[PDB]
Chains A and B, each alone.
Chain A
Amino acid sequence: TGLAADIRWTAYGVPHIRAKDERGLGYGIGYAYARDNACLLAEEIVTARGERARYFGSEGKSSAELDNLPSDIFYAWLNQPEALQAFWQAQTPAVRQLLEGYAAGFNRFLREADGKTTSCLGQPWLRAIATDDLLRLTRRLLVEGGVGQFADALVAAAPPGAEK
């Protein structure tokens, strides 16, 4: 009752998470990963939300070397609310609990972080996350072996004009 995790770190910062359920397990994973990589996850969530142009403008790129606006168009298309809802409804109770836990653990670190291991404190894109964000990352991962490889091609797809 309800979200609890025991975490042990060995050499090189490797977390060992113990919990009595998936919810507590996710809690520990989210907290531990946030301590090491909160800024990385925040940036990638921005990308998967299709908000790179919102925070960084059109001149910049994602970590996958896609222009911010084409990337935003692709991920806005990919991660529409209807798509995320259907994915969530298809998840087992165990998986939902893992995700809920992860989000809560990540967010707990954000609340308490004082910059000791986090270089992006104060940035507007460094913010609390939700389970939907983790779904956006999962779907982004999924299409890497498919339509994700054609992100630019999708954005470029426009009907012909009155030419020739």
Chain B
Amino acid sequence: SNAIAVGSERSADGKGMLLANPHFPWNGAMRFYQMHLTIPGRLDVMGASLPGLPVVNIGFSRHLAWTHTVDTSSHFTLYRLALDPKDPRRYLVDGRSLPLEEKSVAIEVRGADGKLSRVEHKVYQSIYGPLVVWPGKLDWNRSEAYALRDANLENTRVLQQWYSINQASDVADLRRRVEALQGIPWVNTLAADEQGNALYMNQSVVPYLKPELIPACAIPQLVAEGLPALQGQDSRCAWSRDPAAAQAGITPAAQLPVLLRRDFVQNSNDSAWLTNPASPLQGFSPLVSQEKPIGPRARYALSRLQGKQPLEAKTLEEMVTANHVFSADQVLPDLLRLCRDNQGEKSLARACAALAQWDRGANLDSGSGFVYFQRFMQRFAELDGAWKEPFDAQRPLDTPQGIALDRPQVATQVRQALADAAAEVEKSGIPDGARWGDLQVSTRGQERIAIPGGDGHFGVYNAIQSVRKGDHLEVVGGTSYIQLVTFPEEGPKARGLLAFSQSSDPRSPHYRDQTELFSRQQWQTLPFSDRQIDADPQLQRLSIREAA
């Protein structure tokens, strides 16, 4: 997901502005749905929500717009159990042997004969939660096992939290409401208001460990592999309690990253660190936020946001609609030099031409150079020390950069990586004259619709995720609900789309209508006021009631 909030110091109108670009599945339980909710006098919010939820998850009101991105904070901890040497179904806490609780669940299973048979399954549980096994990594032997404690299991506040957000007036009010309830499960919150405040919040439900406990309670090997693993044989490694927290064992709001500014804030699924590099966020628990090198999407955004020039709504919109593959900025120049140093290698001929013709984008008309670039980058990432300028923590926005072609070993592997990537591409059934849009589609009934965008790992702000199905790439997730909000005097001007349309049902008139528009990248008005809604020639109305 991407999110950009712009304040009074940077916006062309001196007012707030927000671009909401979450990246979510195009099917299933997390498929966004547009709606506008009003209880006259005390509620008026519009945006998108998830199936089953009677609140708006991402949206805007009279003076406020907000959105979310998935954070990098941990919302659970693994616990390595020290098993009783006499009994692998018992585990030790403070040297004392405790029994595992066993909960059996019964499942009805339909056979081909259509008969229902009953399957019983035992779920083993510790004081921390259920046991989990990753064969070859997290095993359950006679020495150790692993349990998982999910913080959001006790989060009964999630619905009230979004309902409260739906009622928020401005950025300050939104912040109060979110910090007071701590009901946001696992996302960042970014917002902007008419007054021109831009807010970033890493305010979610995060397991709390007092700072002095961390170096003793962590499992070094596992945390180095990105797992929030703790020592489960020590009672002192239980989540710390702070009466200020809305929930026992979670991190108090005062200790979570917040940035309130009037220039801008952004997030593309990296930590809170470089939300705005002018004011870096540091000094948090590793469970909360770390100073990791940012992904190409954030790096792209910051390259468009840094500076003194006023930001327009059009500028933010085109950050999405341009479909620029930003990772090509770091490697393609030197890759083309390589292609020039190796003319008449024959094996490299098709690839070097395609890469040279390529518009460095993931548009419908983008050439096969994108495909070659993708396969190459998948191999280039597996090479060791091939960046000319490796990551410099003093230059986190401009590094890494370039291919170290002045080192003969590197030049050897990069050319091999290219020849391999080329080989894979020629092998596949890709016709000549094939553009990216001919490849990436979304199926609607018996037809296809070409979809612009590419994988976010390649620095495409308009992130689109697809898998190979038959002759094509079928979109499964990515850019979904788009919302760009400004605050002119009349009221909120909201602009965007729901990329995959309102209905998942092929029989509906709204099964592919917005999808056709997304293909053409033609965003639309999101009507909010009574006058905007009345001005719609497609306006329909129905009043329903029934006895309670």
Contact = CB atoms under 8 A, between A and B. Distances in A.
B123 A16 contact: no
Given A55-B110, A147-B129, A138 B503 contact: no
A110 interface: no
A4 B545 CA distance: 4
Chain A at the B interface: SS class: helix
Contacts of B138: 153
B509 interface: yes
Interface in B331-369: none
A91 B33 CA distance: 24
B75 A156 contact: no
A145 B186 contact: yes
Nearest to A107: B546
B545 A116 contact: no
Contacts of B109: 53-54, 57-58, 69
Contact of B107 (A72, A80, A159): A72
Interface string A33-71: 101111111001101101101111110001110000100
Contacts of A6: 541-543
A158 B133 contact: yes
B135 A156 contact: yes
B377 to A, nearest CB: 25
Contact of B527 (A10, A50, A57, A87): A10
With a 10 A CB-CB cut-off, give which of B122, B132, B140 has the most chain A CB atoms.
B132
A53 B108 contact: yes
Contacts of B186: 144-146
Given A7-B541, A69-B119, A51 B28 contact: no
Interface residues of B, number: 97
Given A138-B159, A154-B130, A21 B52 contact: no
Contacts of B545: 3-5
Interface residues of A, number: 101
B466 to A, nearest CB: 15
Interface string A88-120: 001110110011011011001000000111110
Contacts of B31: 37, 40
B76 interface: yes
B506 A119 contact: yes
A158 B140 contact: yes
Nearest to A89: B156
A153 B35 contact: no
B51 A108 contact: no
B510 A12 contact: yes
Contact of A150 (B75, B148, B153, B542): B148
Interface stretch (B4-12, B259-267, B281-289, B531-539): B531-539
Contact of B37 (A17, A20, A76, A156): A17
A119 B445 CA distance: 12
Given A25-B39, A73-B105, A115 B507 contact: yes
Contacts of A140: 29
A148 to B, nearest CB: 8
Contact of A146 (B30, B75, B533): B75
18 contacts: A1-B548, A12-B514, A13-B508, A18-B40, A20-B40, A32-B35, A33-B51, A39-B504, A50-B105, A63-B27, A73-B107, A80-B103, A90-B156, A117-B509, A146-B150, A147-B150, A150-B148, A154-B148
Which 3 residue pairs are nearest across A and B when measured between Cβ atoms? A145-B186, A2-B548, A63-B28
Interface of B: 25, 27-31, 33-40, 43, 46, 50-55, 70, 75-76, 88-89, 103, 105-112, 116, 119, 121-124, 129-135, 138, 140-142, 145, 148, 150-153, 155-160, 163, 185-186, 498, 501-510, 513-514, 524, 526-527, 533, 536, 538-548
Interface of A: 1-23, 25-33, 35-41, 44-45, 47-48, 50-51, 53-58, 62-64, 69, 72-73, 76-77, 80, 86-87, 90-92, 94-95, 98-99, 101-102, 104-105, 108, 115-119, 133-134, 137-138, 140-148, 150, 153-160
